[PDB]
């Protein structure tokens, strides 16, 4: 059909045909595959927490940095108006 094999497992001895083979759950019985891959669970879930919190920290820095950015520009524009009329200040002074 790498590539898929077939859809028939035939036994020529009696004509018994296994149409498909289904396996339910991999048990592994030992307690050491068990809550040691469970520490693997804890690490493979902590990585997800760290990734999402890092991305949110970056977006928080996004808000902070964009804020500081037009903070600068508006400090700037208000100093613009202040100097525009400091013109009249120093003229008349």
């Amino acid at each position: 059909s790498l590539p898929k094999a077939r859809d028939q497992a035939v036994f020529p001895q009696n004509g018994l045909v296994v149409s498909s083979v289904d396996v339910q759950s991999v048990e592994p019985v030992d307690q050491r595959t068990r809550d040691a891959l469970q520490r693997s669970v804890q690490l493979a879930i902590e990585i997800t927490t760290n990734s999402q919190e890092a991305a949110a920290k970056h977006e928080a820095q996004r808000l902070e940095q964009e804020a500081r950015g037009r903070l600068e520009r508006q400090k700037i524009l208000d100093q613009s108006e202040a100097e525009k009329a400091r013109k009249e200040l120093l003229e008349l002074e």
Binding site: D22, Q24, S25, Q38, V41, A44, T48
Partner: protein, 101 residues
Amino acid sequence: PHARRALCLLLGPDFFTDVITIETADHARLQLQLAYNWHFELKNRNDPAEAAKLFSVPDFVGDACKAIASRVRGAVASVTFDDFHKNSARIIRMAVFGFEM
């Protein structure tokens, strides 16, 4: 395996309030309650062969639940917990009948 027994084979649309114990690629052991919205299909509801093919499997409820549970668990096995929860219904529904049509 064998709990209910009735004289009639329900062909009308129904569901199975089945819960599976699956494990994703992040090993996250989670149980999950399923429905399996099912209904029997007969194109010719008089032919003896097709009509008797209804009673082919004697535990069709269990067969449907086990097959869908197996395929769902196998497909969620290939995805992280983050993926299995972002596209939860998406991946489980493509798990049941994986194809492209």
